[PDB]
Paper text:
ABCA4, also known as the Rim protein or ABCR, is an ATP-binding cassette (ABC) transporter essential to vision. Transporter assays have demonstrated that ABCA4 actively transports N-retinylidene-PE across disc membranes. These studies provide direct evidence that ABCA4 is an ATP-driven importer, transporting N-retinylidene-PE from the luminal to the cytoplasmic side of the disc membrane in photoreceptor cells. It consists of two homologous halves, each containing a transmembrane domain (TMD), an exocytoplasmic domain (ECD), a cytoplasmic nucleotide binding domain (NBD), and a regulatory domain (RD). Over 800 mutations in the ABCA4 gene cause Stargardt disease, the most common form of inherited macular degeneration.
The final model contains 2 ATP molecules, 8 lipid molecules, and 1920 residues. In the presence of ATP and absence of substrate, ABCA4 exhibits a conformation very different from that of the ATP-free structure. The two NBDs form a closed dimer. The two TMDs are also in close contact, leaving no cavity at their interface. The ECDs are positioned differently from that of the ATP-free form, placing the hollow channel directly above the EH3-turn-EH4 cleft. In ABCA4, this role is fulfilled by the mainchain carboxyl group of T2070 in ATPase site 1 and the side chain of K1054 and mainchain carboxyl of D1061 in ATPase site 2. For example, in the ATP-bound conformation, D1102 in NBD1 forms a hydrogen bond with H2202 in RD2, and R2107 in NBD2 forms salt bridges with E1270 in PH1. The helical subdomain of NBD1 moves together with TMD1. This twisting motion, not seen in any other ABC transporter, places helices TM1 and TM2 within van der Waals’ contact with TM8 and TM11, closing the TM cavity completely. ATP binding induces a major conformational change that closes the transmembrane pathway to release substrate.
Numbering used by the authors: 3 to 137, 273 to 303, 308 to 331, 339 to 350, 362 to 468, 498 to 881, 914 to 1164, 1199 to 1280, ...
Amino acid sequence: FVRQIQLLLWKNWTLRKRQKIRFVVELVWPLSLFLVLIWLRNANPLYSHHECHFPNKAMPSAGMLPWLQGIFCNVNNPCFQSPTPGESPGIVSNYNNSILARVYRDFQELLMNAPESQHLGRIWTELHILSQFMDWGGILSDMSPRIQEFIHRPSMQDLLWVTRPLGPETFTKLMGILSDLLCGYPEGGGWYEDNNYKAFLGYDRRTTSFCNALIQSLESNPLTKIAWRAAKPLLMGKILYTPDSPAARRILKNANSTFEELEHVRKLVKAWEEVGPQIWYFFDNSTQMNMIRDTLGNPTVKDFLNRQLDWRDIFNITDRTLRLVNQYLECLVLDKFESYNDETQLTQRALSLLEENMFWAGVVFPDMYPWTSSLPPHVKYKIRMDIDVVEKTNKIKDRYWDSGPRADPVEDFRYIWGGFAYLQDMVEQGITRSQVQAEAPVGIYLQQMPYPCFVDDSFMIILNRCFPIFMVLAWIYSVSMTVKSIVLEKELRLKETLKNQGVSNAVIWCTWFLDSFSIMSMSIFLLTIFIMHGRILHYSDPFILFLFLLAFSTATIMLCFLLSTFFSKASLAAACSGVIYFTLYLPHILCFAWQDRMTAELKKAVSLLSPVAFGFGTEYLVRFEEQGLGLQWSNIGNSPTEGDEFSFLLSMQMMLLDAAVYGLLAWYLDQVFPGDYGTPLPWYFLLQESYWLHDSFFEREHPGWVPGVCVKNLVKIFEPCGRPAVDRLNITFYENQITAFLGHNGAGKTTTLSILTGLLPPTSGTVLVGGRDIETSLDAVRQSLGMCPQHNILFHHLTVAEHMLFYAQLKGKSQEEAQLEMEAMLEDTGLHHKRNEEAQDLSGGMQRKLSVAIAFVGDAKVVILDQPTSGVDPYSRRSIWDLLLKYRSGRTIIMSTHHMDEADLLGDRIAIIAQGRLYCSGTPLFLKNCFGTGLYLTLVRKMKQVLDGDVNELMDVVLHHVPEAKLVECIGQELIFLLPNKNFKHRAYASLFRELEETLADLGLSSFGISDTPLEEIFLKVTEDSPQLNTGTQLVLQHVQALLVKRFQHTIRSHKDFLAQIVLPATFVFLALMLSIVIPPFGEYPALTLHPWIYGQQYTFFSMDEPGSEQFTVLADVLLNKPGFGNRCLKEGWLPEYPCGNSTPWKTPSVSPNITQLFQKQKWTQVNPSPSCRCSTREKLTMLPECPEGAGGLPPPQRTQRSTEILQDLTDRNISDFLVKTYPALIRSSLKSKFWVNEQRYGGISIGGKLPVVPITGEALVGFLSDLGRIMNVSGGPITREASKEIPDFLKHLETEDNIKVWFNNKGWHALVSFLNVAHNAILRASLPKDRSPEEYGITVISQPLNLTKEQLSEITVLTTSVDAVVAICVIFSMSFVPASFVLYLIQERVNKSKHLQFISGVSPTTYWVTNFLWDIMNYSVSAGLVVGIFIGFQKKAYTSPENLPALVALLLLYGWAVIPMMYPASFLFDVPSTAYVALSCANLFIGINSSAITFILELFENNRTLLRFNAVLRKLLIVFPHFCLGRGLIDLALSQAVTDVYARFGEEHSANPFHWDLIGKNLFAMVVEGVVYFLLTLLVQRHFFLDEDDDVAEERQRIITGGNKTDILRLHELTKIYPGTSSPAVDRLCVGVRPGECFGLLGVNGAGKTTTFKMLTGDTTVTSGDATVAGKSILTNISEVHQNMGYCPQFDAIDELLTGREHLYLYARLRGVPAEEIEKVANWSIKSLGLTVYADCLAGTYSGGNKRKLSTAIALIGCPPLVLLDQPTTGMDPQARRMLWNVIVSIIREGRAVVLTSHSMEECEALCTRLAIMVKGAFRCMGTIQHLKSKFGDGYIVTMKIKSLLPDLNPVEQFFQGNFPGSVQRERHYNMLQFQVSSSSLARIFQLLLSHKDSLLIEEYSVTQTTLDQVFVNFAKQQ
Ligand SMILES: *[C@@H]1O[C@H](CO)[C@@H](O)[C@H](O)[C@H]1NC(C)=O
Ligand SMILES: *[C@@H]1O[C@H](CO)[C@@H](O)[C@H](O)[C@H]1NC(C)=O
Ligand SMILES: [Mg+2]
Ligand SMILES: [Mg+2]
């Protein structure tokens, strides 16, 4: 058993060593597929980041001025590297380096603090007041130098130098100068609606016209448009509140403090607009004019005072600046809060407002009723906002933790730039202002927590989605190859011929599994090494990956085993295998979309498919990679997400279970659906059963004669045509005998012998073999059987010696005995010189000898030979005769022959069948006694060229010498007579033979040989008693019509192949689309009350700064102990889901003394207060840095409050260092015991802060301005008074001191708003009046987004884009598997000679290829129409939109037009169909998928500009492949529609045309050019480099060489061919000339070079030397006319397996140009005059062995060519059929044409052949006419005898011959016959002497020939 696997594996590895290219490709293909990933990985480095310390973010509780400053400066999240001054303990400004700050600092330190300056100013003011009442100088001069250095210092100097440019490039520069002016940051900085496909796309307002023009100027340009779209609602929007109760009115009246404060500046600018003209009037006409005149008069008045030490223009610019400001500020909408009454009405008005983009928010107070006016203690509200302006509500944090602070100022701060945090703060400030009478002014500053230096690997996003698909597409080639190999091996009968030799089924399955597993193991080892050392996966243990890949290889091998039991034709198993393998992977892509509602049970159930479990395992690999973990043998078994029972170990466990199930199911189905050549198939309950899985022509059984094989009432009916092939046999083959099985063609010989084996199931009767019935016990029978099939089936690239060694060892023989057996059986069959020639380079006869040879190796007790010698020369048949007669001791040999002398000699009991049933059977002597026995004399006639002599005088002579004589046959010089055998004169016959011998030339006879009754005459008795269209347009149209009809007639009968190659890919696309529409329905967004305890079990900290105040002390208390941190545990109940726990006393954690030693040892104080922990990445990646033991100082004291959370009082510590340096430890402590990471600190509140406020005190400013108004006569104004009336409340709410900071972590989405809510609860509860318990009161915010049917942009567009990309790659799959199906039929034709036979007819390469291209275009058009119809049906708007449908149609049709002529040249490489199919399909798959993946992933995630430069080039490099063109077209058609949908969502409706020359038009034009160029190229590939002698022979050579004759048709001249790598000419130096009236016969030993001569004569192979002129036109130069003057019948039949005989004749009569009116008669004649009358309407596949030769001969003869080359026309044909063919050929050569006939039956080439030529070793020996040959090379008579009873009885006759005929050699003494070459005087003496002693001896049969041709041929074969 192990030995048998050893042998099969050795054979497989030998055949694999013979072909190394396929091996290398099979080991390299997946590595080749895994190249774009390695290139991208080498393209994207790590790029570790830095600390990223973030600045403050003010809020409307902190006043207005810092609010706007923090809106303007912090609009980008600058990401500094060094800590901001905002994270200092009691400092919150964060703008200390601003130039205004420096100038103000200088102004304060110099001027105001200076006491003398204040005194001087007061003195000047008092003097001015005294002067006004009426209506010092040194001190003022003293402060004049004080002013100087104030300008000189670089603050004021810088202010002037930077205001001097004041602004070219306002968009570029104005914000630059403002940002350097207002704040002073030290240089901080830090699909997709991209223009990639953008370019292709292409109101009264009830407001002042100023703002009409303003909004249009904003709306018109995208640079101003996308910013305005997000900024508009805040400046112009509305706010809507439902309850309308006076309580809500009170809350919102208290909440307009910001908007009233913003309206105050509008009041002031209006006041200046009014009052300015008064200033101008005072400067123009006032007492100032007298003042100036006095100043002008100073040189005459105060010249000394003057010497001691534009107005319009400055007033002008100031007037302009204020007005330009005024026009903008005028139409801000600062009356926002607009009441309503119900939720539904609010939503209706929200729909009304959102279209114009005004809706800001809607505030709903659920607890309120319209008739309410008292605020409850615990008040709640909900801020209903849009969904593109508020973060998602159903989820609280992203599914997978990835490193990164999440600080993008656009896609993460939706709560800030959108306007949720601001409005929440205004409303909560309103509430805390309405409950308590007091205020407690405390502003709130956010602060984002800092971060360590991460690495941010940019590759893991790409490898996240394209890794499983590539790791699955890697193995599609191996899967297709394994399934195709299994099906092809079981289709070519190569598996049944193994089961006959003894091997079981278990061994075959085991070797298939072992070989496939070894190959997959090699490729997998290579793949894991390549991935590891390619740095694609960094941390993952390679051993785990290797084991995972082994598990998947086993699973996919068993899947291949299951798939191989479905199909039965390799042309049908090459497409379905790959498509079904990929179809079992789409469920994984569907499972990626849901990502939820995936119960582990359902995940396992879906994973019950192996390629889905592989996808799951790959997902877990990728997830564990992006965490720095990897699967180090402990990580296995636990998922990286929140809660999954699914894991990695269980993934490959399910894979192994899948492999087991598939293997068991394949094994079960194999024995119930065995296929075509299957044995009697067991019933479906094989496991259930306890048993393991004229009646006188027949001779009676003689005594003894034990039977070996019995057949009883056998019936076999091939269904489609009835007509049972084997009707009712009652045969019984015996033990020690060679039973010859004869019968006419299509009688039931091969079918009966196949039923005798297991190859076919009988449909009735029983077949006992050796006593063991055949359907029940077929294994014991086949342990001792050897068969030789009619069509030789044997491995190609195995040699001869290896064939015999394989088959001899496969039956128990030790290595050594196989050597002896092979040597002996090479000696016995004459194959010694061909020991090492491959079994495909052998000649036909040598293959036939090898088959019968390998049928006898080992000891088989039932040997079944089917045509053992059909195509073997008359000499090599003696070797086979001795071989049979030697192995007849106990074997029940059963030979089915068509040579009657063979069956008479060898057969010991013959049985003739006819029409299925047995006709007669018995010992041949008994048969000849039953039917008419007689004595036949077969006299030939010569020619002078009309056949010499006449049948009149010969007839008269024969009837004169014997009056009863009947003429039996007279076909072409044969003229066989029949004479009576009983009661003859003994003298009349002798006189007749004397008369014939003495006059052998007067009658023209040349030969005559008597014979006792042969078997052939008995068998004949049984059988009887049982013009051209002219060239040009007409002929080309006829050729096109004929070829199209042939293709159609072949297609319509094999409908399964047409479906599985055309319609199935469309079904695959349809299934992909049907899975595309199964997506979860959109559910509405929930309430999501915002509180910090959402995440649960977290760390929070607080830091009490500024501890001297009392209000902050009570604030810290009411935030710490009494009411708790947040809103939970407020003594009344809140969210019963979250309980009210108990607290823990103040506790400080322990620490190692190592830390304490470090902390009292060094002196790193107040900068770097903890060891600056290294965070490098280049050495080891370690995304989160490793940091020493003293990371963040000694741990701060902690406790657990009533709410479950850890409070860390980091009061007197560095905050930023603590969080930065203890983040990684906090993450790592979360990683363990859970294997999924999550941060445990989400924020805290740091009480304390200060904001330096200028001391204006309010009243001083208004008094100062009023004093200037009284003095300057500028006082007075309605609007001026109205604006200046509320000044103190304008300076109150500007800036707020004593603030609160709120540290928040953004990786939890709802952290900032929840902690803002907590802070406002603290400020309310701190501000409360006394005696009122703080616990009762609180606030809570609810965030329910607006109740619209809409998804967020960040999710809906990616879903649709990914879906369309997947659909595109599925379409590429489908349309790449189709065009490879057009090479199956081309190779099927080329491997046969059907293409060459059509070329021998009128068809010329251009017409053939053009017609094939037309048919392929039609079929592809059908498939593309199916795909397009599917897209129309599913309403995929991206492709089937009325603007994008022509693009799709053109794309698909031109891809079909452009890829087919690319597949045509590949039909010249592969020599087996279904291997070209697999290879071409896999190549197309790889090219198209890779090109589309590149144009997709690189475009979406390759920001690097260096990659883009290479990519741009590669587009133009890859334009050459039409697959790339189709991929780009489809992906761009998806992306353009995605972008258009994004645009139309906002309301622009941008429409694009697809045919832009940059979009897809280049692809279309390139496809056209590619199609034309490739068709010309395939035509070129077709046209160019397509993939001392005797005396008579010497005389003919001189005749040809010196002067060539002018009457010959065929004139060979020094023909020669040396086969490549042989070093000995197969055919060398032939010179013959065939006249137009003779049948030149080319006899020859096997492997002498006969078929090669025909091959080079027609034009198949390549001549090596010399011409061969056919009717004038040479071969080497021009072959078209040679083909026009020739008809060829190949040795091996070249027919189409699915066209009847009639349609074959119709095709080949149309091709030769017979007119369409005279084709019925030609077909009828060729059908009637060659047999074929019954089988003229059955497919050429359902033909018998000889009925294919009949068809080939009929094909060769249509069209009347004047030179017909028949290459063995009669091999395996009935005597009657070959008689009719002789009649045809004789008619031919009598009509006036010539035929070159090759045959191995010497009766033939003696009857109808005019001139012979025996060819040995590639050169002639005789080349003479029949008479002259039998004269020069022969003498004497041949007395052949047959004695009856064995070998020791042969002695008396030898003594008789030696005593009578003195000189008489002995030739060919077989087991029972003798053949002496007597040299007597005359034949009458031999006849009389042999007949008179016939009774004394035991002569059964006899024959006295006269130097037959067999003697000549056997002499030649013996010599060489
Ligand atoms: C809001 O949507 C919810 C479903 O999530 C529905 O119950 C409710 O009636 C809707 N309210 C309005 C005002 O449309
Ligand atoms: C503290 O721990 C370190 C860690 O190995 C050790 O080497 C050292 O000896 C300990 N004692 C000190 C630093 O005093
Ligand atoms: Mg047969
Ligand atoms: Mg041959």
